A = this chain, B = another copy of it.
Amino acid sequence: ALKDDAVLIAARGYVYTAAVGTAAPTPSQLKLIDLEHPEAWDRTGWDLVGHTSEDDLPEFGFDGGDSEVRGSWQKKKLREVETEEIADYVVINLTQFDETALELYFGPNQSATPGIFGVKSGSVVNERALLIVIVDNDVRLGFHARKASLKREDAISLATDEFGALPVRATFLDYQSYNLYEWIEEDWFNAVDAPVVYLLDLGGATGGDYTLLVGGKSTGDIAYNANASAIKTAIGAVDDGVAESAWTVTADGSDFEISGPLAVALGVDSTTGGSGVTVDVV
């Protein structure tokens, strides 16, 4: 079907790397994190690859994919066979000459000396997890590969009125039972029917001092004499990246409907009236 908000014009592309197998931000975190400071994220281990030419994007590519139709002298077309299976890659033109930019291109520094970066002869093993985030509009199509081999795509480019650049090709390789790579966007892939709601029960009103965890992070605690606005302010004050304005909470007397940008569950339970005010189900 046609979707005017799934049409994409990549405006800027951030690129991050980490040790092999490192997990990317989940689809619901990718809408809330900032892209400029990876040391702030929940998924520690990622860091920015460096500056990239800001009129250009990470250049996807492949080689192989050479495929042709085959048959028998009875029936002339019956399969298309892929003769050389697709080897899939992305090219990244760093413009930095910092050590942490050269290590993507040359592999690890071979000298201990302050102020020198040394290169040895022969091939190097150099492979990383790779996360790319492509930004347009308020969209953030992420891309994640758990293992990519990094190699020099071409020699270092220097020019008298265009920035110096050192291009790496990251080639994707499969790793354990995981996928070759994954695209990350919560609105587009495996999407639910639009609303989700959690029903916080209230029938156990003899009560106590229970609490919620929201996206895994605690709200402190809430007393049994609860109110829809009071629990919206409690949930909306969890320090997780998203404000009280994003949450919708309403009542049907015996329970509250809770809804918003993140998962909600009960943490520590404390109540006299059995399960009746410590139930939170979808």
Interface residues of A in 62-118 (CB under 8 A from B): 62-65, 67-89, 95-102, 109-118
Q: How long is the Cα–Cα vector from A279 to B213 in the complex, in angstroms?
A: 38
Provided the pairs A34-B215, A241-B42 are in contact, do residues A27 and B156 lie with their beta carbons within 8 angstroms?
A: no
* B-chain residues with CB within 8 Å of residue A114 when the two chains form the complex: 27, 186, 189-192, 268
Structural contact, A115 and B172, CB atoms closer than 8 A: no
Binding site secondary structure of chain A: loop
Interface residues of A in 32-84 (CB under 8 A from B): 32-34, 36-40, 42-43, 47-65, 67-84
Structural contact, B65 and A6, CB atoms closer than 8 A: no
Provided the pairs A1-B49, A183-B116 are in contact, do residues A261 and B37 lie with their beta carbons within 8 angstroms?
A: yes
Structural contact, A116 and B189, CB atoms closer than 8 A: yes
Interface residues of A in 258-276 (CB under 8 A from B): 261-263, 265-268, 275-276
State how many angstroms separate the Cβ of A141 from the closest Cβ of chain B: 6
State how many angstroms separate the Cβ of A202 from the closest Cβ of chain B: 14
Structural contact, A190 and B116, CB atoms closer than 8 A: yes
* B-chain residues with CB within 8 Å of residue A248 when the two chains form the complex: none
State how many angstroms separate the Cβ of A242 from the closest Cβ of chain B: 5
Q: Mind listing 11 A-B residue pairs with CB under 8 Å?
A: A1-B50, A1-B98, A7-B164, A33-B241, A42-B276, A51-B72, A54-B160, A72-B95, A114-B268, A119-B179, A119-B181
Counting from the closest, the 10 A-B pairs by CB-CB distance are: A27-B115, A51-B72, A241-B241, A115-B186, A118-B179, A1-B48, A6-B98, A68-B87, A98-B188, A40-B261
